[PDB]
Amino acid sequence: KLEPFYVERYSWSQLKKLLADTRKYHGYMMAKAPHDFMFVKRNDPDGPHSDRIYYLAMSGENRENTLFYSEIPKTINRAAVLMLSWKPLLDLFQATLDYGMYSREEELLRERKRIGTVGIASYDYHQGSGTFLFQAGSGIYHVKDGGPQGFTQQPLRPNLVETSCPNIRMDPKLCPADPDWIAFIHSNDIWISNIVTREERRLTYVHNELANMEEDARSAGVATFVLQEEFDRYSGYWWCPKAETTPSGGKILRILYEENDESEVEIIHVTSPMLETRRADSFRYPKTGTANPKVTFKMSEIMIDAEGRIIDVIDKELIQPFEILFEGVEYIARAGWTPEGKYAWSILLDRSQTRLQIVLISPELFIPVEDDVMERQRLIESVPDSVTPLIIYEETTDIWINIHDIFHVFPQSHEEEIEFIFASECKTGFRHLYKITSILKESKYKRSSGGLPAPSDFKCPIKEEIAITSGEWEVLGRHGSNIQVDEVRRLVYFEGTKDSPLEHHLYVVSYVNPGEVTRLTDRGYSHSCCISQHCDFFISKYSNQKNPHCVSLYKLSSPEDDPTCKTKEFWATILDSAGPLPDYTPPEIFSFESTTGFTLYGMLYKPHDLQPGKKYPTVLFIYGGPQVQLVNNRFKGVKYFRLNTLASLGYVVVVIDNRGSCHRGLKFEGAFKYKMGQIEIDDQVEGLQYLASRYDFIDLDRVGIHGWSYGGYLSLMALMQRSDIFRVAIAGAPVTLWIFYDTGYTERYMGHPDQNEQGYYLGSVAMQAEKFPSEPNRLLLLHGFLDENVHFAHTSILLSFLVRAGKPYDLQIYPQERHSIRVPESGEHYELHLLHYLQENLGSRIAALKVI
Amino acid sequence: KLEPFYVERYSWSQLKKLLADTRKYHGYMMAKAPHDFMFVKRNDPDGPHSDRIYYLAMSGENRENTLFYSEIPKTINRAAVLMLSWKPLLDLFQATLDYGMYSREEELLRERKRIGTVGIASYDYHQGSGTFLFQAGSGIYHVKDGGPQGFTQQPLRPNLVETSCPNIRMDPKLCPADPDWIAFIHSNDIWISNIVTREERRLTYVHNELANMEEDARSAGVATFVLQEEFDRYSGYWWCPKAETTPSGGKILRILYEENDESEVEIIHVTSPMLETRRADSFRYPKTGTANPKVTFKMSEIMIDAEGRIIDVIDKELIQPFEILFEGVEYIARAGWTPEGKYAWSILLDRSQTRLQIVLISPELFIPVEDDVMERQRLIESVPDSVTPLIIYEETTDIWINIHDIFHVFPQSHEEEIEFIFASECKTGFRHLYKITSILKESKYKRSSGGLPAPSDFKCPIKEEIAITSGEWEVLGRHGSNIQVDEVRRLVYFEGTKDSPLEHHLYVVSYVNPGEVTRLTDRGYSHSCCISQHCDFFISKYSNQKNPHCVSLYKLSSPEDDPTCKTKEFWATILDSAGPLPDYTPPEIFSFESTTGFTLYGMLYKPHDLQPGKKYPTVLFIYGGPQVQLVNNRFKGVKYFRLNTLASLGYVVVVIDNRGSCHRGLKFEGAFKYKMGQIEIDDQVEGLQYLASRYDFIDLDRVGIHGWSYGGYLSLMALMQRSDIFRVAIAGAPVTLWIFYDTGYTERYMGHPDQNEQGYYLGSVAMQAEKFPSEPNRLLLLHGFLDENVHFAHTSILLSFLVRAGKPYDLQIYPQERHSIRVPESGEHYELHLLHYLQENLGSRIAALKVI
Ligand SMILES: N[C@H](C(=O)N1Cc2ccccc2C1)[C@H]1CC[C@H](N2CCCC2)CC1
Ligand SMILES: N[C@H](C(=O)N1Cc2ccccc2C1)[C@H]1CC[C@H](N2CCCC2)CC1
Ligand SMILES: N[C@H](C(=O)N1Cc2ccccc2C1)[C@H]1CC[C@H](N2CCCC2)CC1
Ligand SMILES: N[C@H](C(=O)N1Cc2ccccc2C1)[C@H]1CC[C@H](N2CCCC2)CC1
Ligand SMILES: N[C@H](C(=O)N1Cc2ccccc2C1)[C@H]1CC[C@H](N2CCCC2)CC1
Ligand SMILES: N[C@H](C(=O)N1Cc2ccccc2C1)[C@H]1CC[C@H](N2CCCC2)CC1
Ligand SMILES: N[C@H](C(=O)N1Cc2ccccc2C1)[C@H]1CC[C@H](N2CCCC2)CC1
Ligand SMILES: N[C@H](C(=O)N1Cc2ccccc2C1)[C@H]1CC[C@H](N2CCCC2)CC1
Ligand SMILES: N[C@H](C(=O)N1Cc2ccccc2C1)[C@H]1CC[C@H](N2CCCC2)CC1
Ligand SMILES: N[C@H](C(=O)N1Cc2ccccc2C1)[C@H]1CC[C@H](N2CCCC2)CC1
Ligand SMILES: N[C@H](C(=O)N1Cc2ccccc2C1)[C@H]1CC[C@H](N2CCCC2)CC1
Ligand SMILES: N[C@H](C(=O)N1Cc2ccccc2C1)[C@H]1CC[C@H](N2CCCC2)CC1
Ligand SMILES: N[C@H](C(=O)N1Cc2ccccc2C1)[C@H]1CC[C@H](N2CCCC2)CC1
Ligand SMILES: N[C@H](C(=O)N1Cc2ccccc2C1)[C@H]1CC[C@H](N2CCCC2)CC1
């Protein structure tokens, strides 16, 4: 047997220094890498550059995220490496746009989007005009570059869209049909504004700001909480991309929009950030098994004259109710328009999130809003029976639909036929690309006859459904991953896991005659990529376990003999890594064949200065919930630097991707359907025991577990289920009662509470307080006091029952925090307390000495 | 030098047992001793009993508080000791009135009154009729005993006052003029009800229950938060004690009432008890320096016919506004009527609470409410100019007015003269009794002339002001202590501190020719007493440090030669102590001459089995705020049993009454005016050092401090000011920012925030987070999560700043608790955690071992 290693026992002040010192040189890495790329052709045969790329980035730390451009040359010196100069697009020389001073609406949107970046978070572009449009702080701004106006050689003054609106304007979008017009949201209604004429018009009259929210529960053009939190949809209006000309010389613009009524959604109260007020803000929060918002589509029809003045605005609604036309639909997951504007589209889910359908909605299906019951019938009867919704695709699953951003509609060959690419895990269990052609036939349902439509009545038959990709690996379509379709060469570029579940790579394949899938990115790195709209360059942001993130540009060509075959050449560097981080030792990726049938992957951080014949305390860092993969071949020295710190003090650090994790397919993900909390710890312990039999340095008598969010949830489950294995559990922002979490997440993974009584019971820590230990110095709870996603009541109710059960707990609250750490001092305190708790209760000599 | 004693290091489970075991036999002592006595004469010359006494009590543990009676015999066997039988007044044989299931209104009233007793909390009696009236749970009940109807020999069925009111009825009171009528409060309005006819009528229409409280801020007949919390006034309506006869054969009844408007009072949100709702209740909470409620007096005039039917109700208001008539008055502290009903009285304070005035208010000063501006003038002009308020007494102080319940009005000899007894600390600095005669002259102010009255215009001159008592000791007049006036013998009975600041005693003295103050209670015990209305018996609830509370009845007589001289004879026991509690060692009272000029008193609990040549860890239990005295000659083995437990484990336990404490006079109490937090710890440390020089067993390297409420406040101040002395601080429900505490308390002791910027700063822990220690295991915060008095934000804001400052803390929340512990499991957990924290961080070997 082996001697236990005890960590050096630092004071709280000493640990504060140690932590500060190791973060000092490491301050550069808090800075957004170049993103939101767009390529624009120069079309200058005499000039040296083929393209100008535009992107968002920070030049350094303590500096705002802004628009830059770089110049792509026609030719390169292949002896050398081209570093592209970042030229700032905007005049920011003694001129800041975003300070950190956010409205409530911005604060919340930042939580929902998970963005911590100051400045421009995104932008719109209109290629015909060269018009950029972006929100930055209070203001909405525009500049022109890359259109007929030409290419600037110097930074541009951002032009403020002026306003009479009193409150923050949100979600600005350029009209693709007319770039003089923008729309935005203000106090939950849609407005438009002309950036030349300065004319500004409110389109929807659904919310009064002066009313208190308990009465005034309607909104237009904006996505409600669950859409933002659980479906990554932040906008609820979409411009029609074409204008109908009028005989007068004018035009008609159209905005499709979601109108929401939250009246029957339950109201909770979250503590207001201004703690001194001793008040609480109301939120509409659909808890599991309760009402989601009443939703419908509406359409705004905007008549413009010959010289851009608004003649009239006509608010239109669906000819029959949403619930009749789209039987069984609970959520509008996505929406848009077809490229030529003939039809609006939407991707629609049922409440259980096991049925997806894609529906085309003609504008002819909307009529003017008319309270007058006589002229309303005239309007209804005038719309022909042949005009119905068209369900172009419908799919089901025993597990769940994962919503993604892949959907590409080709130009129409024929009036009665639509051709598109979609992705799905429902055929094979892995997300793949399918080219689908649907027939747009007149429905058997005729409104005139005065009945309601039967469920199948709007289903379009499928002419062809060809699989473009296939295999035991997924195409990526969520969280920034998407496709790029080259309609000339008839190819589709996409990101996937074909080569490895630990690396994302860029692939290309024919959509017309699909076969060999060609990998474009180099093995040994994981890549996040985007492809020029012209399909002749791509950019890869890439790293691996040993090497920090770089961003490089690659040129695409094909050989003379085969235009389908695509090849790559390095062109230039956009961002270099500046070596490997000093005093960072990366982990080793390991794997083990589980008794569950699956290979499971993990990361092991060995203790630094590992003495032979000693056994070391062990810390299991965990997330283990859906939509996340911790273990992959990416640089972990930025986001997970403190795992390396733990290792440096003498902790073994372990991370395992249990079943339920991302990037292993739907069957793998599906392992915990109805069963959250019941399976994940078995995987964690199995991985832990694999390591322990292989490596005698792991002291199994001193294992700790720590996680945030689903990680905190599981940290509690570890302690409750397996007190024999886990000595301490440090749970951050856990769910302790699934009945208090929301509809969109909870019902997806656990179903309705009445149809899973035991799953809800067993998955709910707070129902099981008696199962916690009766020894102190094992349970530490952490929570953001202002958290509106995971309410603090998860913790307060757990404590309520721990107190009744006579069980000890330790507790830390971060009173300025929600479901995130945004105040640096909060993070500093957390890290310090964590290291101190581990030292005193797991790792040190004194920890061992106090265990009776 | 001496060897340190280390406490035995128990596990959490072992400590849970130890604590449970020591509380098992000790369960009897959670039971209300007999109180709310009333003596009624039998007037039966042939019978064996002179009186029947009625009182409230519990027969045992886990049983409701109810009405009992006992029989006082004409004669006793003086060889023996008479134990009076407790005969239950009510039929409760298979019949419970109060369960623990309270409305919000009851929950809050119980917090304000500080009552933890289930059942009848109080009762009314009408001596003419024998009618008892009392609320118990939902219901209002009545029974008859002791009037013309006679004396029951068996328990009575309580008769429910029936109702059509939907919601809890509160604050029932019998009309003294007509015991067929009661009044009560329902949804913040005054109602009356006839208990014979069953007629029920709403009198005020000031609150709509269907409205939400942010709009609907008015109330009638009820005391607002600050009155209840800070002035011990729970009712806001008072029946006129006489009926005016009408020529029809009917009568007029009158209720004076306070009408409140809380519209401009700030609204806070407290977490709702039903934690699962994830909601928060609105409270009107006047924080320091902000608006108190707009108050006025109103009067309800109720015309009854010959056979008890209401003819009409006329709501009347003051002829001129309250703010004009009572210039400078902020608070209505007390109100009532003169014994014959000619005048309403009120005791009125200014905002600074340094000016008291007593004012008589004629009913002629109220006119009908009339919106119509013509008939309103007719009504105003009809009231003669000579009718004004009469300020019969006015007093000021550099320190503060302490409100008390002493005020006795004699019957009028003469129309233009009023004679009364009041108490005051303003003349001498100690509360004494004064007989005052004031002249009721017509005021120089005449309304007709159309001006506003000058401040002095309603002041009555003082004919005589004779001091009845005097000296360096106080008469008691708050929290149950009052006087009893014998108008025949011309004597006044009162409780006081004349013999000792550590013992309360009963005294008697002449009010007409005052001199020798005669003590009636025996030395060596502290007494709480009440005197028969007939002034020939009293009852004393008495204890001392060695002996639990007893209740005995004493007969009063005077010798033949001198009816002024009063003497006492033991008659009977009501409650016996049942010996001394086993395994309880009481503390020794000590004292020391402070460098501040004052003698300070303390209690020392020596460690049990005190080994010679060892030094022991020391725990300072503290309150140290105003209105409380911890150190006196009373039995501490019930409320402070865990101090004895600490002593049994090996802690030295110390309690000191620093300056600011009760029962030492106003100068003593005044020491911290403007200076709360600055002086109390100096006294505590001085007492601690007195003990340490005298007793070598006190280890000054291991001192802890613990308190609740003001005690928790001071525990934080100890750690912040004196980290050299106090190793650990366990602070329960502290104020950390005086700006968040209320008007009535905070401004009394600390003035307005603008006029005491430094005092507020220095007294506010949360402004001084940088002054806390940078070592962990020293600060433990405890708080009731639902606390509406000391909001949880005191703790959450402190933590906010501790986190920014990088300072460690420990935290425990009691999620089912307010500013009290009412759920037994919460108390169990608290006691357990406390002992464990002290063991691990102060007292044990492991505590000493972890101090680097
Ligand atoms: N920082 C401001 C700015 O740059 N603004 C540009 C701008 C664009 C659109 C809408 C508003 C604004 C204001 C102004 C710069 C000049 C400054 N003076 C006072 C101190 C010395 C100089 C006043 C503020
Ligand atoms: N943050 C902006 C800024 O500082 N700018 C500097 C600057 C320099 C060159 C070109 C454009 C700009 C914009 C503006 C500050 C004033 C603000 N108002 C909103 C209502 C009250 C104040 C609108 C935006
Ligand atoms: N709504 C979820 C959430 O915030 N949860 C809090 C929480 C706490 C305990 C137990 C379960 C949960 C769920 C989040 C949805 C987005 C997802 N992102 C990960 C990488 C891309 C997508 C993370 C989870
Ligand atoms: N009586 C059961 C129980 O108490 N159980 C304890 C227990 C412990 C471990 C494993 C299984 C069990 C079952 C369950 C109570 C809820 C009930 N629902 C049906 C209608 C609505 C409520 C279903 C059964
Ligand atoms: N008796 C219930 C149970 O054991 N269930 C098991 C079970 C299994 C399948 C389906 C439903 C169920 C419910 C729960 C036990 C914990 C209890 N708390 C409230 C007071 C403190 C503890 C809530 C009820
Ligand atoms: N960036 C994350 C963060 O700071 N979070 C705070 C927070 C608050 C509420 C809900 C979720 C979250 C996640 C952290 C990533 C690294 C991890 N380290 C701890 C010691 C080892 C590595 C902690 C989480
Ligand atoms: N498996 C544990 C162990 O060996 N540990 C080593 C160690 C070192 C540092 C911090 C924690 C730990 C836990 C032991 C389990 C039984 C326990 N008994 C004490 C009272 C009765 C039960 C003692 C600990
Ligand atoms: N406990 C109740 C009571 O004593 N009441 C007296 C009383 C007085 C005023 C207003 C309401 C009431 C109800 C009733 C006793 C008889 C009981 N039966 C059903 C189970 C077997 C017997 C029903 C309840
Ligand atoms: N707590 C009371 C009781 O139990 N009593 C027993 C009892 C026995 C003899 C004489 C009087 C009494 C009163 C009554 C229970 C029913 C309650 N209602 C209010 C609205 C809904 C229910 C009114 C009071
Ligand atoms: N309103 C006060 C309160 O609750 N406070 C909470 C608290 C916490 C920290 C610092 C100061 C304070 C004041 C209480 C008023 C009544 C008083 N009683 C004691 C025995 C009879 C009268 C106790 C104090
Ligand atoms: N400038 C002073 C300060 O900052 N001080 C720090 C400090 C520290 C220890 C001891 C004394 C002091 C004084 C105070 C700031 C508030 C100010 N008020 C007057 C008008 C409203 C605000 C009065 C002075
Ligand atoms: N600078 C102020 C001060 O020192 N004062 C002393 C002083 C003396 C007499 C009268 C007024 C005053 C105010 C306070 C220091 C603590 C600070 N907190 C906010 C951020 C965290 C810390 C609030 C202001
Ligand atoms: N009856 C009091 C109580 O339980 N309180 C709870 C509580 C909660 C909020 C605000 C004030 C209070 C007071 C306790 C009296 C005895 C004391 N013991 C602790 C160990 C030594 C003796 C503790 C206080
Ligand atoms: N006066 C303290 C003492 O002697 N204690 C005995 C003891 C035993 C049990 C629990 C607490 C205590 C405190 C010592 C003060 C200085 C401190 N240094 C360590 C790092 C630098 C400063 C050590 C403790």
From Swiss-Prot, chains A, B:
Cellular localization per UniProt: Cytoplasm
Record GO terms (molecular function): aminopeptidase activity; dipeptidyl-peptidase activity; serine-type peptidase activity
Gene3D superfamilies membership: alpha/beta hydrolase (3.40.50.1820), Dipeptidylpeptidase IV, N-terminal domain (2.140.10.30)
Record field: pH dependence: Optimum pH is 7.4-8.5. Little activity below pH 6.5.
Tissue: Ubiquitously expressed, with highest levels in testis, placenta, prostate, muscle and brain.
GO cellular component: cytoplasm; cytosol
UniProt entry keywords in alphabetical sequence: Aminopeptidase, Apoptosis, Cytoplasm, Hydrolase, Protease, Serine protease
Pfam family, one: Peptidase_S9
EC number assigned by the record: 3.4.14.5
Effect of D742E: Loss of enzyme activity. Loss of dimerization
Protein activity control: Inhibited by zinc. Inhibited by the serine proteinase inhibitor 4-(2-aminoethyl)benzenesulphonyl fluoride (AEBSF), and by di-isopropylfluorophosphate. Specifically inhibited by isoindoline derivatives. Inhibited by Val-boroPro (Talabostat, PT-100), a non-selective inhibitor, which triggers pyroptosis in monocytes and macrophages.
A GO biological process held by the record: immune response
Disulphide-bonded residues: none
Catalytic activity reported: Release of an N-terminal dipeptide, Xaa-Yaa-|-Zaa-, from a polypeptide, preferentially when Yaa is Pro, provided Zaa is neither Pro nor hydroxyproline
Induction remark: In activated T-cells.
Protease among keywords: yes
Result of altering D742 to A/S/V: Strongly reduced enzyme activity
Active site: S709, D787, H819
Enzyme class: hydrolase
PANTHER family linked to this entry: DIPEPTIDYL PEPTIDASE 8, PROTEASE FAMILY S9B,C DIPEPTIDYL-PEPTIDASE IV-RELATED
Family, per entry: Belongs to the peptidase S9B family. DPPIV subfamily.
Task performed by this protein: Dipeptidyl peptidase that cleaves off N-terminal dipeptides from proteins having a Pro or Ala residue at position 2. Acts as a key inhibitor of caspase-1-dependent monocyte and macrophage pyroptosis in resting cells by preventing activation of NLRP1 and CARD8. Sequesters the cleaved C-terminal part of NLRP1 and CARD8, which respectively constitute the active part of the NLRP1 and CARD8 inflammasomes, in a ternary complex, thereby preventing their oligomerization and activation.
Complex and partners: Homodimer. Forms a ternary complex with NLRP1, composed of a DPP8 homodimer, one full-length NLRP1 protein, and one cleaved C-terminus of NLRP1 (NACHT, LRR and PYD domains-containing protein 1, C-terminus). Forms a ternary complex with CARD8, composed of a DPP8 homodimer, one full-length NLRP1 protein, and one cleaved C-terminus of CARD8 (Caspase recruitment domain-containing protein 8, C-terminus). In the ternary complex, only one subunit of the DPP8 homodimer is bound to NLRP1 or CARD8.
Protein known as: Dipeptidyl peptidase 8
Species this chain originates from: Homo sapiens (Human)
High-level lineage: Eukaryota, Metazoa, Chordata, Craniata, Vertebrata
